[PDB]
Structures are given as structure tokens and as C-alpha cells.
Design a protein around this nucleic acid. Structure first.
Length: 49
DNA sequence: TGCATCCGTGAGTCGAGGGTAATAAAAAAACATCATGGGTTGAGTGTGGTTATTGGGGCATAATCGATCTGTA
């Protein structure tokens, strides 16, 4: 339960869901990110990615 | 001299939630320490008490009107 709770809420890929519009809802749930565990960082990422 | 190796660097205001957790032993004795409760100091705040009065009203001792029967050309 500790590990699953840390992933659900304390991880980078789980963040508060935007609720301004239904469009914001859809475009936040249909989102692809290249960060988080095993991914790049904004400082590290160059140009090709 | 060439080689790998290590060591700093790299923006700017801003917002919103904002904290989570793999584990573990009990006895005993011994001692320290605060917590409450009851009793002296002591420290007040509390309350009447005598004696300084200064305006006010008062009674004396004087005073300036108001009203009528006797003396002078």
C-alpha cells in the first residue's frame, strides 16, 4: 500500500487534473509526456527529442 | 605527448498543492521528577475615622423715603 500510494500522488506523472473546460479534461487525459522515471529532463533534453 | 578522468557551468518573474514510510521484546529494579495539596509570609486593596475649612444666612446698627396737624404774611 505504501508503494502504490507513493506512485499515486507523489510521482511526477500523476498531477492535479485541469478542470477549466471539458476540452482541458480531454487534452490532459490524452497527454503524452517524455519525463518522469526513466525519461528525460528539461535541462538534459537537447534538440533531436 | 596523448590518454582518460574529473570538475563547474547553464534565467526570468510567476501558482497550487504539499505531504509519505520496509521494520523492531520484553521483564525487573532503580532512580529522577513533576504534580497536587496544605501551610506560613506578605502584599495588598478596603474602610472607616478627626480636622483644615469658605460661601450662605442670618440679627445689629444704622439710614431715606412715605403719609398728616401745628406755626408764619
Amino acid at each position: 500500500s505504501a508503494a502504490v500510494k507513493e506512485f499515486f500522488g507523489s510521482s511526477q506523472l500523476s498531477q492535479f487534473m485541469v478542470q477549466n473546460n471539458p476540452l482541458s479534461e480531454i487534452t490532459h487525459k490524452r497527454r503524452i509526456s517524455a519525463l518522469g522515471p526513466g525519461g528525460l529532463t528539461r535541462e538534459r533534453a537537447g534538440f533531436e527529442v
